[PDB]
Design a protein around this ligand. Structure first.
Ligand code: MG
Lengths: 295, 131, 412
DNA sequence: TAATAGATTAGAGCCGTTTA
RNA sequence: AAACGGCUCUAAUCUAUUAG
């Protein structure tokens, strides 16, 4: 069950970009269900398959496939069960316009069994790490810190964030929840709601369709009917429209894949990946912090 | 009867400053940003695993077609898209001939022994996990 | 100064589009039939007038069509006219097509091998008509060309469209939410979920929308109860958040109302002759076989057959009150062997659910969900939930409607 | 400590490859 | 573990209440 996670974790100390390729992926035709078609039917997706692998092989080899199109750091933190461990993923833009997307690691441990929140000291440590990373990569403090997570930020941990953040810097905390039971259909066509439509329930909470029918792709990124993601501005001041625009922008940086877009923002996904990688094995001091060693 | 706000699709940059919505099409027409010169592939696996990886790598070199080529673009080929060579004749192969711990440790210490001792450089190690 | 690419159009569209777009990227004026949105007069005129090179695609389908063959023939006539040996350059791509079986008119011509490493072939093309003296790159031209034809056919258009949601609004609520001081009339070991009408044990009370004498048949100690003891609260204040006291907090009483809604839906469907399946966190309510006319409502089929199993459209409903008092439903597929007995194992259920949802889409899901909800309605546009003898919960048959200013053309 | 809920959260696995 | 999705299953915690 934990082969990939353990292998990626044990390679973290001696930095080695590794890609695990299953035999059932590379040469799927040979392995057959013993009564018919191969156990994995990749015939419809071969090029796409190659696409992803090539991009992954181009990413871990130190190549940057695509950028994004300032002064704002988007930080997605995700809690993994082990005690719980919070792991972050940061992305921003520097003076060179080459988007920096590495992700903050060194998971912060909350001893509580089910409190998916950070103690004040851990929150201050995480925010200091992220802010100092921004300062080192941009020689100046960011204009805004855009925290988003799959959990709602409590008053205590957000207050700790506010104490530890510097002046003239606005920080926003967003609860991005998936699998919200709002199946919005289409009554005239036979095809689902197109990707990008948003249902603003309130000035701070809304539904976003980061996935669905795409005109350019001439089909849907999701089978059946798309499930919108609930974007709620839980803390801080921010326009809901700008927040949804930022979330749609984040849904483009999935270097782990060659796909038009993914249902959830990339920062949360990569924070989840590095969190699984870390929690696979024993503690690692100053983890590499670059995605090619986890993804 | 509620207002649905539209968010314009954001453009992801590509080579030569051109921005496209689809990562695949942008890769095909323009290509990636940074020009790594090649991929010194490392393989850690069995003999059949190395054969599978080499055959699929050579398949990657040639264009490969999706069944429905408008909903998911074609693959022009690794050199066609990324502009860097990833041929299968320059591969660094390491042969493999609690249970999760030992199985991980075998590929592991093969990888560290090859990264520490072997002279040849490997940009990325492709662990062909057997099935 | 034009580069002409001739090809088998439907077969070699992908290669031709890629190569043409690249060549425009490097800065070469490229003419192709798929690059332009009679036409034959223009084709001949451009082959004869100012084209410098004539590249011909030589796939297995690129030498057996009259059109490509005779544009090649006229290109050869032009080639002899120019007194230039470097006019026609084959571009062989097909692996099944060897250097034999190639067309006679092109067999002597030194092809450019694209069979392996299309990038290598394009590099050969570029270093070929670099020192062949074929006339500043601007890749934005290639991007614009990609947007103009390959993209404009399917893009974002400012078109109004209407969406049917899964949120079915609650039309009206019982006026008073009532807590009953059932100190001894209610046994402390009794399960109030077993009560015929929804009720919750909050603060030793009996949080329910029903009157004080509904719980009589199964709870016969409760008569002769002084109604002054029960506390009745206006539901409008609860929903609007006005009622927030030391007795009950606003969020708590809203949560109790939601639990009452869920229990009321559950026991109503218990009386609606729909079968239940224990989901992970809720109950899925579906229809057996033979219970619908031609296994369909109106013209929408809710139960069908696939691979020796019977699939049934089912729904799992919960109530929420944040945006509005509304019941959100979830659509599921429940599989049975003969249509009457549920499949015990859940792995086969999940696999069959994936296989069925493989071919189900937006229109099918929407029509099935609307058919189910309208099939649960005794009213023409409302669903009754029995929360009280004189009080009912009304769920609108039509879910929340939505509209959008930007949408897409639907090809079908 | 146990129970009944709603609301949030996290873990897995599992099938299909997105209607031309 | 190419990948993204849909779904299914399980568990936990926070609240409010009731029985230990
Ligand atoms: Mg990967």
């Amino acid at each position: 069950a934990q082969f990939h996670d353990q292998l990626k974790a044990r390679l973290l100390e001696h930095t080695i970009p590794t890609q695990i390729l299953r035999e059932s992926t590379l040469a799927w035709r040979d392995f057959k269900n013993t009564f018919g078609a191969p156990i994995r039917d990749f015939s419809k997706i071969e090029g796409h398959l190659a696409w992803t692998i090539s991009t992954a092989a181009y990413y871990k080899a130190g190549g940057k496939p695509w950028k994004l199109g300032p002064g704002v750091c988007y930080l997605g933190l995700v809690y993994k069960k082990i005690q719980n461990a919070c792991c972050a993923a940061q992305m921003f833009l520097d003076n060179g316009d080459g988007t920096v997307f590495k992700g903050e690691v060194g998971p912060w441990y909350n001893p509580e069994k089910g409190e998916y929140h950070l103690k004040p000291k851990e929150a201050k440590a995480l925010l200091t790490q992220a802010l100092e990373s921004y300062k080192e990569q941009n020689k100046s403090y960011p204009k805004e810190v855009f925290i988003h997570a799959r959990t709602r930020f409590n008053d205590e941990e957000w207050n700790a964030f506010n104490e530890v953040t510097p002046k003239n810097t606005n920080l926003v905390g967003v609860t991005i929840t998936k699998s919200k039971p709002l199946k919005l259909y289409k009554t005239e066509g036979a095809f689902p709601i197109m990707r990008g439509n948003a249902y603003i329930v309130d000035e701070k909470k809304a539904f976003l369709w980061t996935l669905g029918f795409v005109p350019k792709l001439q089909s849907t990124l999701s089978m059946e009917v798309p499930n919108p993601i609930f974007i709620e501005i839980n803390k801080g001041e921010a326009e809901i429209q700008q927040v949804l625009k930022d979330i749609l922008a984040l849904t483009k940086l999935n270097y782990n894949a060659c796909i038009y877009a993914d249902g959830e923002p990339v920062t949360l996904r990569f924070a989840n990946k590095i969190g699984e990688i870390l929690t696979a094995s024993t503690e690692i001091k100053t983890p590499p912090l670059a995605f090619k060693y986890y993804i | 009867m509620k207002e649905l706000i539209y968010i314009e699709e954001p453009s992801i940059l590509f080579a030569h400053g051109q921005k496209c919505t689809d990562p695949r099409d942008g890769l095909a027409l323009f290509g990636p940003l940074n020009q790594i010169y090649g991929i010194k592939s490392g393989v850690v696996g069995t003999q059949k695993g190395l054969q599978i990886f080499k055959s699929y790598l050579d398949k990657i070199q040639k264009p490969i077609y999706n069944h429905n080529n408008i909903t998911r673009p074609m693959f022009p080929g690794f050199e066609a898209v990324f502009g860097c060579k990833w041929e299968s004749q320059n591969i660094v192969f390491k042969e493999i001939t609690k249970r999760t711990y030992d199985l991980v440790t075998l590929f592991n210490d093969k990888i560290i022994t090859a990264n520490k001792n072997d002279e040849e450089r490997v940009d990325v190690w492709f662990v062909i996990v057997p099935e | 100064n034009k580069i002409f690419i001739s090809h088998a159009t439907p077969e070699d569209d992908d290669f031709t589009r890629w190569l043409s777009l690249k060549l425009i990227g490097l800065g070469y004026e490229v003419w192709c039939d798929i690059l332009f949105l009679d036409f034959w007069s223009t084709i001949e005129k451009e082959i004869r007038e100012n084209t410098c090179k004539f590249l011909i695609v030589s796939s297995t389908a690129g030498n057996k069509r009259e059109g490509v063959l005779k544009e090649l023939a006229v290109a050869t006539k032009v080639k002899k006219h120019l007194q230039d040996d470097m006019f026609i350059i084959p571009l062989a791509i097909d692996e099944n097509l060897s250097y034999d079986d190639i067309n006679i008119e092109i067999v002597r011509l030194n092809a450019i091998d694209f069979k392996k490493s299309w990038a290598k072939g394009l590099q050969d093309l570029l270093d070929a008509f670099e020192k062949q003296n074929v006339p500043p790159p601007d890749h934005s031209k290639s991007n614009l060309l990609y947007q103009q034809i390959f993209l404009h056919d399917k893009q974002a258009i400012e078109k109004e469209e209407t969406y049917d949601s899964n949120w079915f609004p609650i039309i009206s609520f019982p006026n008073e939410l009532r807590f009953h001081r059932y100190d001894w009339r209610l046994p402390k070991q009794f399960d109030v979920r077993t009560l015929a009408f929804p009720a919750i044990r909050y603060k030793e009370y009996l949080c329910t929308f029903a009157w004080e004498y509904d719980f009589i048949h199964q709870l016969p100690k409760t008569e002769t109860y002084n109604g002054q003891e029960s506390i009745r609260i206006s539901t409008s204040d609860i929903l609007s958040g006005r009622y927030d006291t030391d007795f009950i907090r606003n969020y708590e009483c809203q949560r109790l109302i939601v639990q009452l809604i869920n229990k009321a839906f559950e026991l109503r469907m218990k009386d609606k002759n729909v079968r239940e399946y224990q989901m992970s966190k809720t109950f899925a309510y579906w229809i057996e076989k033979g219970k619908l006319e031609k296994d369909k409502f109106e013209k929408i089929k809710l139960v069908g057959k696939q691979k020796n199993k019977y699939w049934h459209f089912g729904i799992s409903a919960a109530g929420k009150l944040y945006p509005s008092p509304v019941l959100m439903v979830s659509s599921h597929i429940i599989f049975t062997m003969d249509g009457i007995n549920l499949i015990k194992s859940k792995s086969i259920q999940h696999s069959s659910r994936r296989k069925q949802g493989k071919n189900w889409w937006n229109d099918k899901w929407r029509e099935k969900l609307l058919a189910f909800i309208r099939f649960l309605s005794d009213d023409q546009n409302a669903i009754y939930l029995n929360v009280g003898s004189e009080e009912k919960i009304l769920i609108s048959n039509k879910p929340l409607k939505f509209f959008g200013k930007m949408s897409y053309v639907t090809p079908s």
